[PDB]
């Protein structure tokens, strides 16, 4: 599985259920993500807050769920990545 580490989950965002995802800026072109440790997840809403990034995985709508996915790293699949152009 052609996968690569673009970012990693740092700390659990506000109760909103967000997760601080620190990865390359190329993530702004991605759609889904992979939680190295549990299972694959999807992106619903993310944005670079100041000097960091907070990605909101699908389903995670509580500090509990988020915390569970805290500390693990995120992987990407070129399959989605853009072409040479």
Curated annotation (Swiss-Prot):
Disulfide links within the chain: none
Subcellular location: Cytoplasm
Entry GO terms, CC: cytoplasm; ribosome
One of the protein's GO biological processes: rRNA processing
Domain of life according to the entry: Bacteria
Parts forming coiled coils: none
Gene Ontology molecular-function annotations: ribosome binding
UniProt keyword annotations, A-Z: Chaperone, Cytoplasm, Ribosome biogenesis, rRNA processing
Subunit structure: Binds ribosomal protein uS19.
Comment, domains: The isolated N-terminus (residues 1-80) forms a closed, 6-stranded beta barrel; it probably has the same form in full-length protein. The PRC barrel domain binds ribosomal protein uS19.
Protein task: An accessory protein needed during the final step in the assembly of 30S ribosomal subunit, possibly for assembly of the head region. Essential for efficient processing of 16S rRNA. May be needed both before and after RbfA during the maturation of 16S rRNA. It has affinity for free ribosomal 30S subunits but not for 70S ribosomes.
Family designation: Belongs to the RimM family.
Name the UniProt record assigns to this protein: Ribosome maturation factor RimM
Range of the intact protein held here: 1 to 85 of 162
């Amino acid at each position: 599985m052609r996968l690569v580490e673009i970012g990693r989950f740092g700390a659990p965002y506000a109760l909103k259920g967000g997760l601080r995802f620190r990865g390359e800026p190329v993530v702004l072109h991605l759609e889904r993500v992979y939680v190295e440790g549990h299972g694959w997840r999807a992106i619903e809403d993310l944005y670079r807050v100041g000097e960091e990034l907070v990605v909101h995985l699908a389903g995670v709508t509580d500090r509990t769920l988020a915390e569970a996915l805290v500390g693990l790293r995120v992987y990407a699949e070129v399959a989605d990545l853009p072409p040479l152009e």
